[PDB]
């Protein structure tokens, strides 16, 4: 009997998205240009809005949402963005698609560790994984007996979460059917996938091509949402917003120079060049940044795609 | 012993799109009449579909099974579900996919033999929900799974084979639906040859949408990814794509089955969309447009409140094309 | 120990070959066009007319016989035939090749129970009653050997029908030989429908029909043709009345020309439904209003893939 | 020189200088290969136990591959018959002075293994560690294949054998037989098997032997006697010679006959 | 319970060559002077590395990682130790190659766990605290023959015993740096382990090394940069060095004479320089040692061009053995 | 403990090597032409004497020696030689990098048992005086070395065909190389750009990983000439007491040019006995022209095996 195990929520992946407040629409079900932290992509945001109103309407029996989109547009960002319109601070457990290939852990025993970070409980709220670390098969068995009484007692309440899984094409054929059997029991959390590839062969069968590396029987219970590439007339805002969280003053042409990077390579490479760029202003004795630094950093560190081209042409 | 209170734990929502199937819809002289209890069109299979059903009642089916071949969008499930009602008012209908044998919570044996019992009042697999152990708790015990042995089976097999003459206990053939057969390999088929040797083995309907491939597990090709020795004991029935009018009755059923009203202009543009990409694709957009009119409260959708859903929610096909278009933008310099 | 075990035989494997009564042989060493269940394919039957001489003079020392042919040249037919001429309830087990890949068991145990199916009293049936396993093997091997040394019940080696051989692996080819070179071994006659391919388990080493020279010199080779439209109707005509179905001359000759489209087995397995169609049309025989009906409603093997490949090419672009 | 190249290394082995090497008898598969291999034990001294095992006789399920290399080496001595698991742990210690004692003397064995290119890299390994012994015998091998990918690796080797061991043994190839050489073989194996044949029947019996096989002719010597017994002629004339040929073939004809069958089936 | 003074147990062959650098050679405003502290040239790679040293010192380095991609033979591992010496006098440093994880003496995760134990520093490191309480050692090569078992519950026991001495006041804990050479050897089963270790507080900082561009990832069937999955390609800091100049060559070559106390004439410093950029720098410095003890055989202890133009002909380079053996086996194919 | 284990040797691999007993150098650092069996290899033998001094000057610290030469070009030769000038009775054991594929001994164990074959006083002998037991003979040699009654000496390890070792054994070999006691190891290849076993996807020189190559030193032996080759067998016949003719040395050298050397030198002992067929003394020409058609090699056999197989 413990109700204070509140030391939870590994945060370092989602710590880079503190600015997001939710989805932030009007009563007319349409999008604003910049609201609740999010900026742009007016297309797919009502697609969150129609889906999230189906959640409380309980229409989503055995359904899922795919997120087909290029690397680096905010497929993590919208995935968090619906986990603030479920409201009352629901849990949100992102992960990585390649986090299931471990050494000592069986492949089922991470998804239980994934799912229990999505099942949330003078009312305070924890996850089922939190009450698992409170006591650390029947080791994870007798923690049912704690909680099944309590909704029958009428004090705590079960709420669903968002198991946002990214880069699905690494996943082999086994975890799908363990997902699919566990997708739709009674109150399992909303499952959202995202990936960036096309015809991907499922790992382990080597002949069945398929869209997005998914077995074809599952995909037709899933709805598909896309997100386009950004434009620099608005792409200035998001890094400006993220730097406005961290108190960093920057000039505008440098950010207009920084916008070239988000066109040449990812946005994920683009927001990287703030905190290892602003720290150089302190050495030159300035708080705000000027054009020399973002110049100087851009030849000091290279992106992964730049690392590809320069290495092989200098290899031969 | 203490298990007659095992009445049903039925599936209601996964078989919940196939609500409007209530038989095969035949004549007494086995003739189609094209509009009865939901089945619209597809007489070519359905006229042949009445034939095997008559062979079931005469006991002429032992050593013979049904294979349905068809594309995505021409009724692999409905004709399979349509045989359930006319064979009996309460028969087991079990609609697993071929991928369901590829579970890591059991081997390929325990997935299929449990699925094999699932189509034999009550089902023989339903006895294993209490008379082996106690499961069915709150939702966190879906996440974990223990193992039932073979020991529970022969004790359970001992009652009902000798409650067979009792009169209170009865046995009834179901039907096993194996979707996507070429996923399975010949480690599993040889188990199925011993399965249909038994007296109470239910009838078998399997699904495919491929032509010539290789058998997985070995290195020889065949029809369908099934070896010849099972192919030469089959009844082989294919289907045909629906036409535009054929769908024009089909989509009227489910909107009637979900109390929404769509416009007569909006009706024919919807089956334009279903004939554009997929028959399955037309289904998911409907309730996805039902919420759309519910904000403006107009109690009947119009065509502009359809394309808003169609502008948002893509299909499976252009979800591949736009990803290749961005992938065109990667490898081309 | 308990010698009343009356029925253990998979009847559906021998169901479609009930109508054979003999080889139809001459004392001149010849055969006839229709006698005791067989029609045509005479030197194939007469090669069995050779082997029935050495099966009764005991000259098959280490030896067996393959059958070679396309699917539907009577390979199961001659197979079940020879147990009749050997006399007085010769035991028979048809075994396909790919019946060995089951997760319950290792591959060698499927084989020895068929070895114990092959050779009144059989060896597999003694092991079913006594239980209610390889521990049970010698205790039953001793007692009937004690009984035959006392002189109780005869034990004649039977016929093994090893079907579908080109998907067999390596370790059973090694395994089979060790009891093969006895005098208590039964005959293990093959059937094949696949040519020059690699022995399974070597993955690189090709062989004629994937069987090693280990066996290719101990096994006798026979070759068959395919049936002509004259000859195969008597196959259908005999099976139509052992299945007890009245049939005209008219619609039968439309049935046979499908037998040169697909195999002969696709012709015969539609006999039972096409008849039960006509019992809804309210007749007792079948006419041409049924053979046109069934073969456009129940599809064959090879056109089933050939239909779906011919339209999948335009559906997924 | 099947008996003339054979006597060459036959003098070294009883001289005492074969140590570290052994025999490999390659050639066409079954050229009297085992027959001349057994004849070397017949060419050897007063008690020379022989074995003719296979290259793939290791791939076993009752006994393991390591068990497959414990028994036949003990058979090719014999300590196996004095044995017949860890039963060797006593008698190898017991006879450590029984050989010096003097009841029954000891001999090495005449191990022949058929078609050693049916092996793998783990099983060639134990041949070296077993041949370290002083009681480790003279061994005989066989193959018909040269440059072959070794079972266990992505690397080929001629003869299927590790290349260091190919220069750690001695190499025999059995000479194939000609028209008179077939003519003596079936003749010797006619009066050995004593069924009356006309003189022309021995002649054309070589004519299929130069095309198809060699035990194919001896395959017919019992069967065609019975179709001669079918007419009660008591000598298989040219009729049954040219009758059962249509009924009895060899596979490289027959699999070719399906091969000229299969293509038009996949064409039309 | 008797190990505060069995402090350092390492190899003297790994730190046996590269002693000639103490730092990176920087001012207060992150510019070098082209000759200071041992580090020699390619200053852009130098001055970017100080930012990684700056970001460590400020408290915003967390999660980020270091990767160096250059040609094989331009001082890749050289740059990482200067980060250690510019981080204090005693910061730990552990050199691990790519193939060092494929142990048969232990599993794929205990070595990478034992990789992380060497890079956690405490003064009066954590890894040697484990090895005395686990097993008893300190012998000759007889114990280098066999092994022991490193009991896992000991590691949590000191993790319960470091809960005594950390916040008490005797011991401060200093993060070291771990080093992974030739990163394109590690399978994806351990990349997730690197994902599941950086998020700790006292987790060290990691620097990886490579020479591979786009390649098939070890473990899956996907061509990617560097043999690294996409999600962990992007939390990195990535630096690239050029091949060396010729003024840079004699600059190092002068410093690499006093280490092995060789006294070189002005003929070798010509030809070793040109031979140094012909095969590899690494093949050049290896040649200095053996030519010296031929010079003593020819009596006079000043190395002139005769020994160097003999030992280059005595000891070939790997770049023409891969010619010579290949050119032999070309002649082997011709019947 | 019980220290009378005098001879434990796999004598057959070194049995054709008991003639070589010296490198044949000057004191001043050049190479003689032909002394103690070593003929030729003029840019090879000075490589040995250099590594002689770096052994003796305690400066083979963390490096390795690789021999690269085609089969027949003396790879086994110079490896036996180096143990003959660092004093006599130094341990020398030849292993082949395919032998580790035992059926019942782990690839840990078959190496450590052959490592301790290479350190003497051997270490392999003291664990077979009696029979882990290795830990029990940890202390036995410990008391002797602090008694100064038995010395500690490194030896030499010789690996052949070494492309057949995977990724795994190298990292057992690389770390275990790095004691202050461990014997130096001689590598031996004949490979070019090869694919490392265990990955199938990393390629490198000599089938050897990119870690342990830069700290390996590279020595080439070249081919031979018949006038070099003819003195080899002339050295051989005197060492076995078998008289021989002049044209025998002319004839047998040609197959040394043709196939290789190891195929040539085994042929004496039967051709000696082929002379004893006719009871003569000298190996006249007809014995020499008789063998290579009767008995085969691996090279010309697999030519005539597979072609007459067709
Ligand atoms: N519309 C948006 N609103 C807020 N942040 C965004 C938006 N689009 C992208 N980002 C930011 O850009 C980054 C891109 O994330 P995403 O597109 O999911 O690709 P990745 O997961 O590869 O980083 C995220 O850090 C996110 O915070
Ligand atoms: N002839 C039909 N009668 C009734 N419903 C049909 C028919 N054809 C298709 N459908 C509907 O279309 C959907 C297709 O279901 P299913 O049979 O699983 O797919 P497929 O048509 O690809 O075989 C189902 O919702 C089903 O109700
Ligand atoms: N000569 C024959 N006599 C009787 N039945 C035959 C004859 N030839 C073929 N059949 C029948 O045709 C069918 C062919 O069976 P099977 O031998 O499996 O075909 P295949 O020869 O292709 O293997 C069998 O039912 C068999 O009874
Ligand atoms: N700028 C430099 N300053 C000092 N030493 C250097 C410099 N560049 C290269 N070196 C030397 O070059 C050698 C190669 O270093 P290392 O990174 O281990 O090998 P590689 O260059 O093959 O990756 C080291 O001895 C290093 O000291
Ligand atoms: N340089 C040499 N001079 C004299 N005899 C040699 C020489 N090299 C090898 N031999 C002898 O010839 C045989 C072949 O050995 P070697 O050539 O070293 O191995 P390989 O043939 O595998 O290269 C050995 O028995 C050795 O005693």
Residue numbers in the entry:
A (entry chain C): 2 to 122, 234 to 248, 273 to 452
B (entry chain F): 8 to 127, 241 to 453
C (entry chain A): 2 to 120, 237 to 249, 272 to 456
D (entry chain D): 51 to 127, 243 to 249, 270 to 453
E (entry chain E): 8 to 131, 243 to 453
F (entry chain B): 2 to 122, 239 to 248, 274 to 452
Show sentences the authors wrote:
R2TP (named after its components in yeast, Rvb1-Rvb2, Tah1 and Pih1) is an Heat shock protein 90 (HSP90) co-chaperone complex assembled from RuvB-like protein 1 (RUVBL1), RuvB-like protein 2 (RUVBL2), RNA polymerase–associated protein 3 (RPAP3), and PIH1 domain-containing protein 1 (PIH1D1) (1–5). RUVBL1 and RUVBL2 assemble into heterohexameric rings with domain II (DII) from each subunit protruding from one face of the ring, while the other is defined by the ATPase domains. Here, we report cryo-EM structures of R2TP and show how access to the nucleotide-binding site of RUVBL2 is coupled to binding of the client recruitment component of R2TP (PIH1D1) to its DII domain.
To specifically explore the heterogeneity of the asymmetric “open” conformation of the RUVBL1-RUVBL2 ring, we reclassified the images using a mask focused on the open RUVBL2 subunit. The rest of the subunits in the ring showed clear density for ADP. Thus, it appears that we have captured two conformations of a PIH1D1-bound complex, both inducing changes in the RUVBL2 subunit where PIH1D1 binds, but differing in the presence or absence of ADP bound to the open RUVBL2 subunit. The resolution in the open ADP-empty RUVBL2 subunit is lower than that in the rest of the complex, and we thus only considered the secondary-structure elements for model building. During model building, we found that the distorted rim of RUVBL2 corresponded to an N-terminal segment of RUVBL2 (residues 1 to 49), which was completely lost in the ADP-empty conformation. Comparison of the conformations of closed and open RUVBL2 subunits from the ADP-empty structure of R2TP-ΔNT, after alignment of their neighboring RUVBL1 subunits, reveals the motions in the context of the RUVBL1-RUVBL2 ring, and several major areas of change became apparent. First, changes in the position of several α helices suggest that the torsions of the DII-external domain accompanying its interaction with PIH1D1 are transmitted to the internal region of the DII domain, and this relays the changes to elements essential for nucleotide binding and nucleotide exchange.
